[PDB]
Amino acid sequence: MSTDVAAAQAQSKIDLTKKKNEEINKKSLEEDDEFEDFPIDTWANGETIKSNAVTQTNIWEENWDDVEVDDDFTNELKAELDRYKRENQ
Amino acid sequence: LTKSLSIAFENGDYAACEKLLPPIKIELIKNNLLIPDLSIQNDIYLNDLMITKRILEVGALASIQTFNFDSFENYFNQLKPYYFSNNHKLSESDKKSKLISLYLLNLLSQNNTTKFHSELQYLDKHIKNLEDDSLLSYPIKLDRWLMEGSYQKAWDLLQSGSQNISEFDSFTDILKSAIRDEIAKNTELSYDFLPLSNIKALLFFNNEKETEKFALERNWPIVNSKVYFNNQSKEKADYEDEMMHEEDQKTNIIEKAMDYAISIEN
Amino acid sequence: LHHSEKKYAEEDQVQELLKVLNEISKTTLTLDPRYIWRSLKDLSSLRNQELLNAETLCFTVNVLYPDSSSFKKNLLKFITSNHKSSVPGSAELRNSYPASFYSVNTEKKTIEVTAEINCFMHLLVQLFLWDSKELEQLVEFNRKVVIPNLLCYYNLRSLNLINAKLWFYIYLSHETLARSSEEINSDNQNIILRSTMMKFLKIASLKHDNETKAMLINLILRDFLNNGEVDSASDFISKLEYPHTDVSSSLEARYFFYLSKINAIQLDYSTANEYIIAAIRKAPHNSKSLGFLQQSNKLHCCIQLLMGDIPELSFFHQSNMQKSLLPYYHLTKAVKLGDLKKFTSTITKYKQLLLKDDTYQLCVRLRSNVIKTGIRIISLTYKKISLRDICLKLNLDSEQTVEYMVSRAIRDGVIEAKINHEDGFIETTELLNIYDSEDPQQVFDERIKFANQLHDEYLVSMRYPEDKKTQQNEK
Amino acid sequence: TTAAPLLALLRENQDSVKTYALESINNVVDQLWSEISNELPDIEALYDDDTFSDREMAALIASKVYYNLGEYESAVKYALAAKDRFDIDEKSQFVETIVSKSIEMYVQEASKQYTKDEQFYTKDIIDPKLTS
């Protein structure tokens, strides 16, 4: 579990005996692991992580969607509605 | 001494309290010493602790109303350790909730929000959900309306903070004054031309002479009922240069190249 | 049987201890003893957790202790006493050594090099508590004994770097004990703790031992952050000169992380942003460091929204942290649209989670920022835009009201517009052609200096170990 | 704690509590050093006034704060302003910090002035409190 692309930070530091325990010490300092407490707290598996296709699981390159609206519905109405105003003028 | 102050305060005199307080500061050396400074608290030191809070509590309340903001704070700081520890034994108090509401207002009128948030963080661990927010809500709401800069909401809240006639009305006047200055800085960027009518609304004045009164003192050149804010921007920009730092503030063409060169030849 | 396991573990400790002991006798060394010590740090944890609990007791008894054995034994009697392996050959020998603290030499008292051994005993017991995961009184006992033992002698340079790690564990158990539950006894003990921290730092200043000081600085900053005395912390950060020398990459990571929190409360959103990206790059990627990284990533997202910068949507999806950062993901979207209605709902809905992380305080400040960010979109999308139209989009009430909001927001100069009151629209002054200005010069000037400083850092580091190979024998 | 109470006492104009204030400040001057440094010209104003017996105490506070600040030369100036309360830090396991820097400061003065003259014991370059 790493932030953004994992391999970019995996190469930055690998396993060393000096730092290994020190890694725990920082985590313990903040107090929790903070990825296992949120499910207990909410008291059910979220649906706000299934809020978009990418939010649950991303095996894609980010679209930049986070609003996800079908735009074919509104455009179809735009074309026809404009046409009527002109026809009834 | 302690009781002589007490009865000065209830009468309704705070000029009486203030005169008689330097005698009470002497005896406050003793009240701080009879408690061992909260290294241990018992039900013996609970009696002692009540004396130490009570003397400072009323002295602090009096200060606001005689417009001695300096003295008000001097007492509030002394309270801080009893509020800080031993919570669930006379450290949480009805007077504590009321007193934090006013303290927060004093800081905001200094016009440093930097201090405000820092105090605010401390109140989270203490009472802010335990005695909930209903008057501890007020100083936060006001801060929000100024940071976003909705000044209608801000002016409204202070207007309704003048129906808070006890000692809360004493920070409200300072905060109506401060707002006039705030919008007057803003309008430098926004405008270069306003009619007199448009100036009057924005600075929250109801009188025409009051608008022209501020304009002289703020150094707006309103000539023919029209301001020229671009003159005003020049002054403020010019002031930023005048302070001697001035060689490297302008930043010389020649100087960049010299810098680059020497680093390579270090 | 049981003794066999203790004996295997005992020998482990002794070789790492013996190695260092030789090194500091030639002249006190810092980084070379530190490398050994750091590996031993990990080891003590994996043996103590998995393998017995009187395994610590065997070593402590066997060496000549000043009182430390007595202190260890009390803890164990309470949870069911063990007195086995305190019998000769486990309380008579002081562990084979050549002469450094050898059994015969020590008993005869030609030597009593108990010094480093005493520091290591403190580390074992403190670790063993944290490994057990017990708080209240066990913590209080650990604090009382070890703090005055070390201060009734002026530590030598070498011993001093060990005791910074002791100061850490005492503080951590104490802090979490207060965060267990509100207690009238927990509260009074925090003043006790506060005093010792700053006193430790003053000793660390005297010897100019760099890693001792840096580690101690972190603990003071953490405690300030938890008590809400940022006022008291502003002063403290202004009088820093933080060493970047003998530190661990774990120390440096924590340090930059602490500045960012203080900075955010002082409405430094600019320096805060560099500092948190910096903290993550020293910090390892690991599942071992995860709770540290989480808090860093939450801190970073919020900092950007307070700028008006708006974090990437990418940041949330590609991380393996989507659930933890789930509120931050929704905050990023809320500010993006300019939606008051969404935003008010998001921070109430997630209030408690936000409140645990002590970032609930930061989030409320974003209420202004939805309004400012809303106006920056609006000036891009429309050059000239009526006052009324803006009110529709952001759910506002009057033309006069939105004029105040923009007036204030361009005093911060984010929108880069100017308001026409007399005509009813807001007209942007953005047209660039800033490649005709001297602006690129300044920007280029800064990049070069950063490059030059990277050379300097290449110089100090590169040639320093070269010298050492000429010094050591390998011909 | 906070250095905030300590400030209040300085801003209060009653003589009794200013005399008291210096004593509270020097007690926890190894906890609140950075905090009190900001409002320290107040303490120089009390030091100047001779309505106090705690001119020695007012001065001694400055010394400790300057060492923790990082300025050792000034810590010693205020060491010598304070007068005494410096022979008890030659046997403590905490603060010997301020004392040692004075010793270093002597060596600085001596080198400049020996070359001019052997006698620098009659010189006033060398402070008598520095010598002692």
Nearest to B80 among D5, D13, D14 (CB): D5
Residues in Cβ contact with C130 at an 8 Å cutoff, skipping those fewer than 6 apart = A28, C169, C172, C173
Take residue C121 and report the two structure tokens written for it.
């005993």
* C-alpha to C-alpha distance for B171 and B161, rounded to whole angstroms: 9
Residues in Cβ contact with C381 at an 8 Å cutoff, skipping those fewer than 6 apart = none
Q: Phi/psi of residue C100, each to 5°?
A: -70, -40
* C-alpha to C-alpha distance for C345 and A67, rounded to whole angstroms: 17
Q: Which residues of D touch B77 (CB under 8 A)?
A: 2, 4-5, 7-8
Nearest to C184 among B87, B148, B182 (CB): B87
- Decide if A15 is inside a domain: no
Q: Looking at chain B from residue 192 to 221, which residues have their Cβ under 8 Å from any Cβ of chain C? A: 193-195, 198, 201-202
Nearest-by-CA chain D residue for B21: D14
Best D1, D66, D71, D98 member to test C by mutation, with max C CBs in 10 Å, is D1
Q: Which residues of D touch B59 (CB under 8 A)?
A: none
* C-alpha to C-alpha distance for D80 and D102, rounded to whole angstroms: 9
Task: Name the packing angle between helices C290-307 and C366-381 (round to 10°).
Answer: 50
How is the beta sheet containing C384-386 ordered, strand by strand?
C384-386, C425-428, C417-420
| Beta partners for residue C419, in sequence order | C426
Fill in the DSSP letter of residue C419: E
How is chain B split among helix, strand and coil, in percent rounded to 5? 70, 0, 30
Q: Do B88 and C182 touch (CB under 8 A)?
A: yes
Take residue C83 and report the two structure tokens written for it.
């007195």
Q: Does D4 touch chain B (CB under 8 A)?
A: yes
Q: How far is CA B185 from the centre of its chain?
A: 20
Q: Do B183 and C407 touch (CB under 8 A)?
A: yes
Q: Which residues of B touch C229 (CB under 8 A)?
A: 118, 122
C-alpha distance from residue C161 to each of A17, B63, C64, C155, C241 (Å)? 18, 51, 22, 9, 19
Give D120 to chain B, closest Cα distance, Å: 43
Q: Which residues of A touch C326 (CB under 8 A)?
A: 38, 46, 48-49
Q: Does B119 touch chain C (CB under 8 A)?
A: yes
Pairing between strand C417-420 and C425-428?
A: antiparallel
Cβ count within 10 A of residue B243: 8
* C-alpha to C-alpha distance for D89 and C335, rounded to whole angstroms: 59
| Beta partners for residue D70, in sequence order | none
* C-alpha distance across the termini of chain B, in Å: 73
Q: Which residue has the tokens 């060398």?
A: D126
Nearest to B201 among C364, C400, C406 (CB): C400
Three-state DSSP class for residue D26:
helix
Q: Which residue has the tokens 């002497």?
A: B26
Q: Which residue has the tokens 């299934």?
A: A50
Determine the longest span between alpha carbons in chain A, in angstroms.
81
Q: Phi/psi of residue C418, each to 5°?
A: -145, 145
- Decide if A40 is inside a domain: yes
Q: Do D1 and C235 touch (CB under 8 A)?
A: no
- Decide if A4 is inside a domain: no
Question: With contact defined as beta carbons under 8 Å apart, do B80 and D5 qualify?
Answer: yes
Take residue D71 and report the two structure tokens written for it.
């300025």
Q: Which residues of B touch C448 (CB under 8 A)?
A: 260, 263
Q: Does B150 touch chain C (CB under 8 A)?
A: yes
Task: Name the packing angle between helices C290-307 and C326-337 (round to 10°).
Answer: 10
* C-alpha to C-alpha distance for B195 and B198, rounded to whole angstroms: 5
Quote the Cα angle for C352-C353-C354, to 5°.
90
| Beta partners for residue C426, in sequence order | C385, C419
* C-alpha to C-alpha distance for A33 and B80, rounded to whole angstroms: 34
Three-state DSSP class for residue C211:
helix
* C-alpha distance across the termini of chain D, in Å: 37
Question: With contact defined as beta carbons under 8 Å apart, do B108 and B161 qualify?
Answer: no
- Decide if A16 is inside a domain: no
Question: With contact defined as beta carbons under 8 Å apart, do C304 and C277 qualify?
Answer: no
How is chain A split among helix, strand and coil, in percent rounded to 5? 50, 0, 50
Best C408, C423, C457 member to test B by mutation, with max B CBs in 10 Å, is C408
Q: Which of D70, D59, D86 is nearest to C206 (CA)?
A: D70
Q: Phi/psi of residue C384, each to 5°?
A: -120, 125
Determine the longest span between alpha carbons in chain C, in angstroms.
100
* C-alpha to C-alpha distance for C323 and C329, rounded to whole angstroms: 9
Instruction: Tell the burial category of B204 from Cβ atoms under 10 Å away from its Cβ (0-12, 13-18, 19+).
Output: middle
* C-alpha to C-alpha distance for C146 and C71, rounded to whole angstroms: 10
Question: With contact defined as beta carbons under 8 Å apart, do C242 and C217 qualify?
Answer: yes
Take residue C329 and report the two structure tokens written for it.
């993901």
Q: Do A12 and C284 touch (CB under 8 A)?
A: yes
Touching status, chains D and C (3+ beta-carbon pairs under 8 Å): yes
Cβ count within 10 A of residue B191: 21
Question: With contact defined as beta carbons under 8 Å apart, do C354 and C360 qualify?
Answer: yes
DSSP H helices in chain D: 4-11, 15-27, 33-37, 41-48, 55-69, 72-82, 97-116, 128-131
| Beta partners for residue C384, in sequence order | C427
* C-alpha to C-alpha distance for C415 and C409, rounded to whole angstroms: 7
Nearest-by-CA chain C residue for B151: C404
* C-alpha to C-alpha distance for C12 and C40, rounded to whole angstroms: 9
Give B20 to chain C, closest Cα distance, Å: 32
Nearest to C231 among B115, B148, B185 (CB): B115
Question: With contact defined as beta carbons under 8 Å apart, do C184 and B86 qualify?
Answer: yes
Q: Which of C189, C187, C251 is nearest to C221 (CA)?
A: C251
Task: Count how many Cα atoms sit within 13 Å of the Cα of residue D18 in the half-sphere of its side chain.
Answer: 21
The length of chain D, given as a count of residues: 132
DSSP H helices in C364-429: 366-381, 387-394, 399-409
Q: Does B36 touch chain C (CB under 8 A)?
A: no
Nearest to D8 among B78, B81, B84 (CB): B78
Best C306, C351, C421 member to test B by mutation, with max B CBs in 10 Å, is C421
Question: With contact defined as beta carbons under 8 Å apart, do C273 and C307 qualify?
Answer: yes
Q: How far is CA B94 from the centre of its chain?
A: 23
Q: Which of C319, C281, C267 is nearest to C298 (CA)?
A: C319
A29 lies in which domain range? 23-89
**Which uninterrupted H or E stretch holds B236?**
helix B229-242
Quote the Cα angle for C46-C50-C52, to 5°.
115
- Decide if A45 is inside a domain: yes
Instruction: Tell the burial category of C18 from Cβ atoms under 10 Å away from its Cβ (0-12, 13-18, 19+).
Output: middle
Take residue C308 and report the two structure tokens written for it.
């008006």
Q: Phi/psi of residue C61, each to 5°?
A: -60, -50
Q: Do B22 and D20 touch (CB under 8 A)?
A: no
DSSP string covering D116-131: H-S--SS-SSS-HHHH
DSSP H helices in C207-282: 210-227, 230-238, 249-265, 270-282
Question: With contact defined as beta carbons under 8 Å apart, do B1 and B27 qualify?
Answer: yes
Method: cryo-EM
Torsion angle in degrees (nearest 10) through CA of C375, C379, C384, C386? -10
Three-state DSSP class for residue C232:
helix
Q: What is chain C's alpha carbon radius of gyration, rounded to the nearest angstrom? A: 29
* C-alpha to C-alpha distance for C198 and C204, rounded to whole angstroms: 10
Take residue B249 and report the two structure tokens written for it.
């503030």
Pairing between strand C384-386 and C425-428?
A: antiparallel
Q: Which of C253, C212, C261, C211 is nearest to C236 (CA)?
A: C261
DSSP string covering C135-186: -THHHHHHHHHHHHHHHTS---HHHHTTHHHHHHHHHHHHHHHHHHS--HHH
Q: What are the E-state strand segments in chain A?
A: none
Task: Count how many Cα atoms sit within 13 Å of the Cα of residue A74 in the half-sphere of its side chain.
Answer: 3
Q: Which of C396, C374, C377, C382 is nearest to C427 (CA)?
A: C382
Nearest-by-CA chain C residue for D92: C152
User: Based on the structure, what is the number of domains in chain A?
Assistant: 1
Task: Name the packing angle between helices D15-27 and D4-11 (round to 10°).
Answer: 150
Take residue A84 and report the two structure tokens written for it.
């009527």
Give B160 to chain D, closest Cα distance, Å: 32
